Design a protein around this ligand. Structure first.
Ligand SMILES: Nc1ncnc2c1ncn2[C@@H]1O[C@H](COP(=O)(O)OP(=O)(O)OP(=O)(O)O)[C@@H](O)[C@H]1O
Ligand SMILES: [Mg+2]
Lengths: 194, 152, 146, 316, 197, 96
């Protein structure tokens, strides 16, 4: 960051075709991610809020800038376990995806897992059909982890109880996350169907 | 730029001027007179006070080809600041008859001269709708409904 | 002195002095634009101000409707004026200073009331303290006021 | 400044400094193009300034209206995200566009009080209360500045100490000649002491009694001693023409006086711009009393008012 | 030489942030404009040089015809850089730019700087050739970025255009590595070539 | 109201020279309330026209009617320094 701040002052007029202020924003985003992993969630969030301000006042910023900022904001809600907040901000990452290398093969499969889990446990989501139709969750349904995970997501979309309740038994034993939300998930299917 | 824009009122001087310009450049058969729209903006009510023709070409074979004069805009803006104090470039008009997707590309370049978001103000020169011919638009950016591709 | 290594050196002096000079000259060319730039704004704003046109001050004699007011102007005459949707009608109340066009006789905008200097000076600053035992022989009369 | 130091010669030999010379040229050509970039942006801008100044010229030249500034209002600039005025209008943030920043209240000579959007070339900085200003005749905007009003009678009033009556040609008159020195002459000359001590200076004086006691005499003389700028005013002289022009004259007089101090401002026979009754009709001669009052106030405004002494006389 | 209008197609790309000409190519292409613009004036002072960009998402007009070198550079400072050449598209806008002029006596020529290979097609470029020689526009390709690591099939279009014209069409090779881009186009024929009937 | 002052006759005179026939349309927009009233066209009368009675050749080969918006104001300059003839409005159907 200190090298990019020196560089930029001469080079904006020197090249006379290029910009170099773009780069500073992205470094703040990476700095915010490192703090989240480290588990200093508050340090990142107040860095992220100041960064937010700057971005809204610009309209000429690259499609790369928005992609780093939303990814970082999603990881914050996943540490906190705000299911609703995660769902919507991960949808915003998907939109801002670039054909350019700024993703891996790992990251697709792992966003797909975390999305599905958040969705089930949201308090206001009904974007189950919106997920189904989306590429991300479409491609991986043939692996053991994402097999049930698809069929749970599918049984909610369609209001169907015969497939839904049969799945819920398995996941109490299998996954302890979903062994204390058992009560929640049964109220949720009924709520949508109504 | 601008985040205050709800409605655009149009005086009938502007609607007639655009109409005249189409027929005094000899541009017809779904070719385009494009001009700048002048008047106050950066308000919820945008009011367009005046308009004048800009030199403009289009080739419908490839719409990634068009001619817009860079000299002409500057010179007209200088003159127009004298007559009324209302007048400044707040967009560009299109002569219709429809909203082509070719209209994004023009709007992209047009942002540089403007002190706001430019407006894309369609004025139809042949009359349409039980409602008005005149329909106004602003360039904004948003996420689609497939949850993929942020398109302006 | 007399060698050709000195003749080579002097030429390199020109090459480095011009390098640096051309830099001191970039900084100068920039200042010439900024100097003109201010001067430009003042002459320009002048022309736009003429086109805006003066106004005449008055005050509400009597609120008659919620978009229409009756006024008395400081030119002498009483008018019945309309009110523009720019300006607030809450900030319009009976007796408040207003300023209204000489083109359409319409109250354009609020004119906050002109403070009267004398009473205003004393509102603004605190006139205090004086001590109770700093006053002698009127000491009873301070207490009686309390 | 100093090129090819001792240090560069040891470091790099002459042959190397040839390769150095070539690299420098290439970068000097880059910078050289920017000068053509910058020259141009400057050239177009000059043309713009002169194109404006030509439009101004016609409005700006004489003839135009004369007015007075009552007060500079100093209305708000910016509290909204659009315009510069409190009310929300179509325009955008500028000194003038549809936006109005500062404004000032003037009292025209066309008998109107105008609150006007302020111009680009006249600022509130360039004003003060009670300044005479050119206002364009056809639309009322402050157009250009003017110095403060000066009048032929006002100019005359300052200096008239000669004829001098002294106290060697005024037979007796004591206690009163001594009393006059104590009030006036003695603090005027030892003025530095009076600041240091912290006592007040007498806040003028009133000399009164039946006529022919020789008041006029003693005030003229008082001024000779102290060698001071003597202004004489008399209550029918002070009022001239329209009675709303009577108020400018008092102010004008006192503007002169306080400058070039010491001074004595002596106002004779006050019996019609200092009446006790408010029944006898006056509307313009009332403003004359009020602008008399400012002067006394600024004596009280110095604490020690050694510099500016005032005397007053009346028959009853 | 005399009475000539020339639409400069200057590309700004991801091959031009390379520094084979000092201090990148953007900086050397600024210096190319100055020499070109002066030279034209030296032959005939009524010469105009225009400018468009094959760069970005949409090729666009950067500057119009003008008798000032200042205005042309003023427009070039803010260019895209993320794009690549689009060669077919460049030619159709440049043809349009050469229509709008003070006088029409001026020669029609296009000179295009290549820093990047075509993003278009051979199918398109075949068509462009038949189109151009009807209107006597020359194609004159300064290549220096489609020979660095590439090959060009643009030789074919030069010859297909060249006939007796207002300005003849010829190919101007400039090494891709250091040779100082600005002096090589200035030294090579750009007014030393002229037309015939 | 619509009338002409001396200063505007001097301005008028040079448009007359530039283009043989030319008009002056004078808009007083604060005695206008129908968008059409207190708007008249005017045109110079020559000094030859008054003395040799070649002034009213404009009352012939036209409607020969003059419609006043200001009776007092037009009549004053009608002999002095102008002849007024009435104004008409037009549009094509696209415009309407
Ligand atoms: N005490 C005096 N000693 C010398 N001469 C005197 C004296 N009193 C009056 N006089 C003479 O009488 C003349 C007229 O009196 P003077 O004009 O001074 O009256 P005043 O008291 O100042 O008047 P007003 O009340 O009208 O202002 C003086 O010019 C002087 O010649
Ligand atoms: Mg006396």
């Amino acid at each position: 960051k200190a090298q990019f701040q020196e560089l930029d002052s001469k080079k904006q007029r020197n090249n006379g075709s290029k910009d170099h202020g773009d780069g500073i924003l992205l470094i703040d985003s990476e700095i915010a991610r490192t703090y989240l992993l480290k588990n200093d969630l508050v340090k990142a969030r107040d860095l992220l809020d100041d960064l937010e301000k700057t971005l809204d006042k610009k309209d000429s910023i690259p499609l790369r800038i928005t992609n780093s900022f939303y990814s970082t904001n999603s990881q914050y809600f996943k540490f906190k376990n705000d299911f609703n907040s995660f769902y919507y901000t991960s949808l915003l990452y998907l939109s801002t995806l670039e054909p350019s290398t700024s993703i891996t093969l790992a990251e697709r499969q792992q966003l797909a897992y975390d999305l599905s889990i958040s969705a089930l446990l949201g308090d206001k989501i009904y974007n189950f059909g919106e997920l189904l139709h989306h590429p991300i969750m479409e491609t991986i349904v043939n692996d053991s982890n994402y097999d049930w995970l698809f069929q749970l997501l599918n049984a909610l979309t369609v209001g169907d109880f015969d497939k839904f309740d049969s799945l819920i038994k398995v996941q109490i034993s299998k996954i302890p996350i979903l062994a204390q939300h058992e009560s929640f998930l049964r109220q949720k299917i009924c709520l949508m169907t109504l | 730029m601008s985040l205050q824009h709800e409605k655009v009122t149009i005086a009938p001087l502007v609607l007639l001027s655009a109409l005249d310009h189409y027929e005094r450049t000899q541009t017809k058969e779904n070719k385009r007179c494009v001009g700048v729209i002048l008047g106050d903006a950066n308000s919820s009510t945008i009011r367009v006070t005046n308009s004048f023709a800009l030199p403009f070409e289009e080739d419908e074979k490839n719409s990634d080809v068009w001619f817009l004069d860079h000299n002409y805009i500057e010179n007209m803006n200088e003159m127009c600041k004298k007559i009324n104090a209302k007048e400044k470039l707040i967009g560009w008009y299109h002569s219709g008859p429809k909203l082509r997707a070719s209209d994004l590309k023009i709007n992209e370049l047009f942002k540089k001269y403007t002190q706001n978001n430019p407006l894309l103000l369609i004025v139809d020169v042949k009359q349409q709708g039980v409602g008005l011919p005149t329909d106004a638009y602003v360039a904004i950016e948003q996420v689609k409904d497939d949850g993929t591709s942020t398109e302006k | 002195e007399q060698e050709a290594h000195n003749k080579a050196l002097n030429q390199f002096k020109r090459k480095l002095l011009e390098h640096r000079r051309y830099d001191d000259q970039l900084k100068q060319r920039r200042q010439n634009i900024r100097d003109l730039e201010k001067l430009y704004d003042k002459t320009e704003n002048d022309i736009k101000a003429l086109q805006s046109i003066g106004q005449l001050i008055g005050e509400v004699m009597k609120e008659l409707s919620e978009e229409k007011y009756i006024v008395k102007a400081s030119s002498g005459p009483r008018y019945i004026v309309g009110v523009r949707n720019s300006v607030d009608r809450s900030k319009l109340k009976k007796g408040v200073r207003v300023t209204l066009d000489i083109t359409t006789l319409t109250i354009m905008r609020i004119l906050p009331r002109e403070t009267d200097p004398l009473v205003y000076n004393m509102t603004s600053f605190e006139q205090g303290e004086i001590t109770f035992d700093g006053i002698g022989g009127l000491t009873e009369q301070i207490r009686e006021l309390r | 400044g100093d090129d090819e130091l001792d240090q560069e010669i040891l470091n790099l030999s002459t042959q190397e400094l040839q390769t150095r010379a070539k690299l420098l040229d290439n970068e000097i050509r880059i910078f050289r193009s920017e000068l053509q970039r910058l020259s141009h942006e400057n050239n177009v801008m000059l043309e713009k300034i002169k194109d404006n100044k030509e439009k101004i010229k016609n409005n700006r030249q004489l003839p135009y209206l004369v007015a007075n500034v009552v007060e500079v209002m100093d209305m708000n600039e910016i509290e909204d995200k659009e315009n510069s005025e409190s009310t929300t209008q179509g325009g955008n943030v500028n000194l003038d566009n549809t936006a109005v920043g500062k404004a000032a209240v003037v009292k025209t000579s066309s008998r109107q009080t105008v609150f006007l959007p302020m111009v680009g070339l006249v600022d509130p900085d360039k004003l003060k209360p009670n300044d005479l200003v050119g206002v364009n005749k056809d639309s009322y905007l402050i157009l250009d500045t003017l110095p403060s009003e000066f009048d032929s009678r006002v100019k005359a009033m300052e200096v008239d100490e000669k004829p001098t009556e002294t106290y060697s040609d005024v037979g007796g008159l004591d206690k009163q000649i001594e009393e006059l020195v104590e009030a006036i002459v003695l603090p005027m000359k030892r003025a530095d002491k009076f600041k240091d001590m912290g006592i007040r200076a007498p806040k003028g004086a009133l000399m009164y009694g039946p006529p022919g006691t020789g008041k006029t005499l003693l005030a003229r003389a008082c001024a000779a001693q102290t060698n001071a700028t003597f202004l004489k005013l008399a209550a029918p002289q002070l009022v001239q023409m329209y009675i709303g022009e009577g108020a400018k004259l008092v102010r004008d007089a006192f503007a002169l006086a306080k400058e070039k101090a010491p001074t004595i401002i002596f106002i004779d026979e006050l019996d019609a711009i200092g009446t006790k009754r408010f029944d006898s009709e006056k509307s313009g001669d009332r403003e004359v009393q009020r602008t008399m009052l400012e002067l006394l106030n600024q004596l009280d405004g110095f604490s020690s008012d050694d510099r500016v002494k005032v005397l007053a006389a009346t028959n009853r | 030489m005399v009475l000539e209008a020339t639409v400069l197609v200057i590309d700004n790309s991801e091959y031009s942030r390379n520094g084979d000409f000092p201090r990148t190519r953007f900086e050397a292409q600024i210096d190319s404009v100055e020499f070109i613009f002066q030279a034209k004036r030296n032959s005939n002072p009524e010469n105009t040089v225009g400018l468009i960009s094959g760069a970005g998402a949409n090729p666009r007009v950067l500057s119009t015809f003008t008798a000032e070198f200042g205005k042309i550079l003023a427009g070039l400072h803010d260019t895209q850089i993320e794009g690549k050449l689009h060669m077919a598209t460049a030619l159709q806008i440049a043809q349009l730019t050469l229509k709008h002029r003070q006088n029409k006596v001026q020669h029609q020529r296009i000179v295009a700087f290549v820093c990047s290979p075509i993003s278009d097609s051979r199918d398109e470029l075949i068509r462009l050739a038949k189109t151009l020689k009807k209107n006597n526009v020359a194609v004159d390709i300064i290549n220096f970025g489609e020979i660095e690591q590439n090959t060009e099939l643009l030789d074919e279009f030069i010859a297909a255009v060249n006939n007796p014209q207002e300005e003849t069409s010829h190919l101007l090779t400039v090494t891709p590595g250091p040779r100082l881009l600005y002096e090589n186009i200035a030294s090579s024929p750009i007014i030393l070539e002229e037309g015939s009937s | 109201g619509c009338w002409l002052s001396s200063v505007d006759v001097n301005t008028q005179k040079s448009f007359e020279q530039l283009n043989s026939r030319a008009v002056a349309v004078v808009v007083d927009p604060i005695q206008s309330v129908k968008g059409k009233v207190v708007i008249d066209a005017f045109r110079l009368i020559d000094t030859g026209a008054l003395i040799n009675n070649l002034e009213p050749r404009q009352t012939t080969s036209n409607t020969g009617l003059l419609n006043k918006a200001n009776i007092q104001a037009l009549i004053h300059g009608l002999n002095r320094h102008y002849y007024s003839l009435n104004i008409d409005y037009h549009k094509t159907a696209k415009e309407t």
